[PDB]
Design a protein around this ligand. Structure first.
Ligand SMILES: NC1=N[C@](c2ccc(OC(F)F)cc2)([C@@H]2C[C@H]2C(=O)c2cncc(Cl)c2)CO1
Ligand code: NA
Ligand code: NA
Length: 374
């Protein structure tokens, strides 16, 4: 408890292409780099020689592979993957010293899934069975891990933006990874890591929307999404306020829509004209909340001879998504055992001399249950 040195720095990434952990599958072990995804629930790996893949799972080489004789088709947007289900022995070399038999989807055909130039070959869905494919009987990796071992039912993530890196602490918390205190928000329902946002401020100015809007139709914590995604009506209100706050300088209307980038000469990004963004989350106690605050350092993503950033807040029709934009400010504890998510200021987050990311409480917020969409 509290210290897991062998797991520190076990994540790598390329900016905007997520964070991956090294895993092994089968016997003898086949090493793969695997995207850490709290937004889905399948352990799915490249299993055929797609041109974009550094490597792939070769089931014929594994003495421990068991075929489940079942296929899985997984459309979404933007993309799709198809595969064949089986089980095999899975380990995390820079994780706990255990080996479990997990479900693996062997991806045999995909569209807009693998990224050309990325260094990962599969994804580790760390969310709940309720959103597993094809259905909730396909046990997710973390569920198997907890069933078959003495690993405590929690994991935590420190994503450090900019080549990026971070830490996935499986089975506990490492106190070196954060400063100040952890504050907890309930997991509303075990499918995605669903939370409830109860208030939103831009530079301390409340958006004053019916808080149900902040959670239409859900709000989730998703390490497999780069951006902070906001429901359309909230995004509209959010940019308008950010536009206003940052009107010292003018940017093309396309910029706020992510349709074009914006640049400055090196060493001269005007951070301070940009507002902080605060989400108040439902707390653990009745009528009690806390707030997490992020900087432009988080929502203006590094992508000429100038420093060019993409506006990394965007509209959604699937609800709020707290992607890397949020998570890179914080140490995030997925406390599955207690159905709660902890946030603390991350010991590695990008800031400046004037402003840092913050996690502050307690605040008094009434009618927070009304903020949940049904
Ligand atoms: N959280 C989430 N993961 C994704 C995903 C892909 C299929 C699913 O299959 C199905 F179960 F929905 C589920 C999620 C993609 C794996 C993520 C992805 O490709 C990605 C690309 N660039 C940057 C990042 Cl941080 C991630 C989409 O959003
Ligand atoms: Na156990
Ligand atoms: Na600490």
């Amino acid at each position: 408890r509290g210290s897991f040195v062998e797991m520190v720095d076990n994540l790598r990434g390329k900016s905007g292409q997520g964070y991956y952990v090294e895993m092994t599958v089968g016997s003898p072990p086949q090493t793969l780099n695997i995207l850490v995804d709290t937004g889905s629930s399948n352990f799915a790996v490249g299993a055929a020689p797609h041109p974009f893949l550094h490597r792939y799972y070769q089931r014929q080489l594994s003495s421990t592979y068991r075929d489940l004789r079942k296929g899985v088709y997984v459309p979404y947007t933007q993309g799709k993957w198809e595969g064949e289900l089986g089980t095999d022995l899975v380990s995390i070399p820079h994780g706990p010293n255990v080996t479990v038999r997990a479900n693996i989807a062997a991806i045999t055909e995909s569209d807009k899934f693998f990224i050309n130039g990325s260094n990962w070959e599969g994804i580790l869905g760390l969310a709940y069975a309720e959103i597993a494919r094809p259905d909730d009987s396909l046990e997710p990796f973390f569920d198997s891990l907890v069933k078959q071992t003495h690993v405590p039912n929690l994991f935590s993530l420190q994503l450090c933006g900019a080549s990026v890196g971070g830490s996935m602490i499986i089975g506990g918390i490492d106190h070196s990874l954060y400063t100040g205190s952890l504050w907890y928000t309930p997991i509303r329902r075990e499918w995605y890591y669903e939370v409830i946002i109860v208030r939103v401020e831009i530079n301390g100015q409340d958006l004053k929307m019916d808080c149900k809007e902040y959670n239409y139709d859900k709000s989730i914590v998703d390490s497999g999404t780069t951006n902070l995604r906001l429901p359309k009506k909230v995004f509209e209100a959010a940019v308008a306020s950010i536009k206003a706050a940052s009107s010292t300088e003018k940017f093309p209307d396309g910029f706020w829509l992510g349709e074009q980038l914006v640049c400055w000469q090196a060493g001269t990004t005007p951070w301070n004209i940009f507002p902080v963004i605060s989400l108040y989350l439902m707390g653990e106690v009745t009528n009690q909340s806390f707030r997490i605050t992020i900087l432009p350092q988080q929502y203006l993503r590094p992508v000429s001879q100038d420093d060019c950033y993409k506006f990394a807040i965007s509209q959604s029709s699937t609800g709020t998504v707290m992607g890397a934009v949020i998570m890179e400010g914080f140490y995030v504890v997925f406390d599955r055992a207690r159905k709660r998510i902890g946030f603390a200021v991350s010991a590695c987050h990008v800031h400046d001399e004037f402003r840092t990311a913050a996690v502050e409480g307690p605040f008094v917020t009434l009618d927070m249950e009304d903020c949940g969409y049904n």
